[PDB]
Amino acid sequence: RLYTYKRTHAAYNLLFFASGGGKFNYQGTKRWLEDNLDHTDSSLLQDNVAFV
Amino acid sequence: LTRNTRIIAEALTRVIYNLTEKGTPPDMPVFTEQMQIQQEQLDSVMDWLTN
Amino acid sequence: YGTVSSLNGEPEQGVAMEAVGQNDCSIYGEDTVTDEEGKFRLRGLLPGCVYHVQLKAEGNDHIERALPHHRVIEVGNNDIDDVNIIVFRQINQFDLSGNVITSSEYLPTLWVKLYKSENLDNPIQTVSLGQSLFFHFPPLLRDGENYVVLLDSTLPRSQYDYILPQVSFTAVGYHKHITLIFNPTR
């Protein structure tokens, strides 16, 4: 709702991640964070990542 | 759940929009109407999740 | 002497701006339609009374909220400066939603409806549930408009027993989470 409207379109890329593999040592996050960092060079997980 | 969502979302909104150095004292909220955290939606989603 | 900007920073234009006084000064106060930058030029600078910058009732139909509704400012022996207020526009859509409670196998054989109240034989939306227990009817306008959410399944009574739910949600609010429960028998 906030991003849909121009006047409230803040300049902050937001990567939401409904991760799987949670209480299991957070494997879903491990694999996801690995794929967006070392596998590729694109993706926002390198651009200007603020607090996660 | 609604209160926690209000707290987190309002903090995020203030930090994102540079509001702190824009006035907006923390003694009044953003999410009053037209953006109220849908209690029904939260309850139904939680119920479905527990289903 | 400030600015009327949007949430992101967009300077609002054409917003009526005024200051209503209090105490004996309740009778003093003028208005000024803001410019593109949001720079209002309120005048009538009488000290000895606190001021309240707030949104004119008239001329501000399109705009829904002003987050700092009023800003208390002490009027001393000088002028005021740097008065920034953020404002919200008036979203008019309804943004319907709503989950469905049913077994997984019945989900593909379901299409939620949006039967208008005035005519229950001419649906206006037939969002199929498909494989997701969540319909997200495209945002509608909110003005009365009693509707129906008749859950039109494809499953006939010849091999199963069921009752299709029906929900009326007269559109005056801003969201909805219809929670249809579908448990057929036989």
Upper half-sphere CA count for residue C176 (Cβ side, 13 Å): 28
Whether B13 contacts B24, CB under 8 Å: no
The CA distance from C177 to the nearest CA of chain B, in Å, is 5
**Residues listed for chain A:** 52
Which region, left, alpha or beta, applies to residue C157 given φ > 0 means left and ψ of -120 to 50 means alpha?
Answer: alpha
CA–CA distance, C182 with C163 (Å, rounded to integer): 8
Mark yes or no for CB contact A10/C10 under 8 Å.
no
A11 and C8 in contact by Cβ < 8 A? yes
C89 touches chain A (CB under 8 A): yes
Which chains does C contact via 3+ CB–CB distances below 8 A?
Answer: A, B
Q: How was this structure determined?
A: cryo-EM
C6–A8 C-beta distance less than 8 A: yes
Resolution in A: 6.6
Specify the length of chain B in residues: 51
Residues of C in contact with A7 (CB under 8 A): 6-8, 10, 89
Asked if C139 reaches chain A (Cβ–Cβ under 8 Å), the answer is: no
Q: Please check whether residue C148 is in contact with residue C121, taking contact to mean a CB–CB distance below 8 angstroms.
A: no
- Choose among B16, B17, B35: nearest Cβ to A1: B35
CA distances from C180 to C15, C19, C65, C103, C108 (A): 43, 49, 33, 12, 15
For residues A37 and A45, is the Cβ–Cβ distance under 8 A? yes
Task: Give the nearest chain A residue to B34 (CA atoms).
Answer: A1
- Cβ atoms within 10 Å, residue C158: 5
CB contact under 8 A, B38 and C175: yes
Backbone angles phi, psi at B47, to 5 degrees: -60, -45
How many C-alpha atoms does A3 have within 13 Å on its Cβ side?
Answer: 6
Q: What is the dihedral of CA A44, A46, A47, A51, to 10 degrees?
A: 80
Q: Identify whether the C-beta of residue C22 lies closer than 8 Å to the C-beta of residue C49.
A: yes
Backbone angles phi, psi at C125, to 5 degrees: -155, 135
Classify each residue of B28-40 as buried b or exposed e, where b means 16 or more C-beta atoms within 10 Å of its C-beta: eebeeebbebbee
Give dist(CA C173, CA C113) in Å, integer.
Answer: 19
Integer-rounded Cα Rg, in Å, for chain B is: 13
- Tokens 């039109």 belong to C152
Residue C48 in tokens: 């000895």
Distance CA C79, CA C39 (A): 15
Beta bridge partners of C11: C5
- Cα separation values, C125 from C82, C114, C135, C162, Å: 50, 5, 11, 22
Residues paired with C54 in a beta bridge: C18
User: Would you give the DSSP letter of residue C186?
Assistant: -
Mode of pairing for the β-strands spanning C71-74 and C50-55? antiparallel
| CA pair distance A39, B10, nearest whole angstrom | 35
Contact C152, C72 (CB under 8 A): no
The closest CB to that of C67, out of B30, B36, B40, belongs to B30
Task: Please tell me the distance in Å from B44's CA to the nearest CA on chain A.
Answer: 18
C5, β-bridge pairs: C11, C86
Inform me whether the C-beta atom of residue C7 falls under 8 Å from chain A C-beta atoms.
Answer: yes
Between the CA atoms of A33, A36, A39 and A41, what dihedral angle is there, to the nearest 10 degrees? -140
C109: Cβ contacts below 8 Å, ≥ 6 apart: C153, C154, C155
Q: Is C91 on the interface with A (CB under 8 A)?
A: yes
From chain A, the residues in CB contact with B35 under 8 A are 1
For residue C167, give both structure tokens: 């929900």
Tokens of C15: 């917003």
CA distance C21 to C35: 23
**Inter-residue contact C123 to C163 (CB < 8 Å):** no
* Token duo for residue B51: 């289903």
Q: How far is B6 from chain C (nearest CA, A)?
A: 15
CB contact under 8 A, C65 and B41: no
Strands C2-5 and C96-97: unpaired
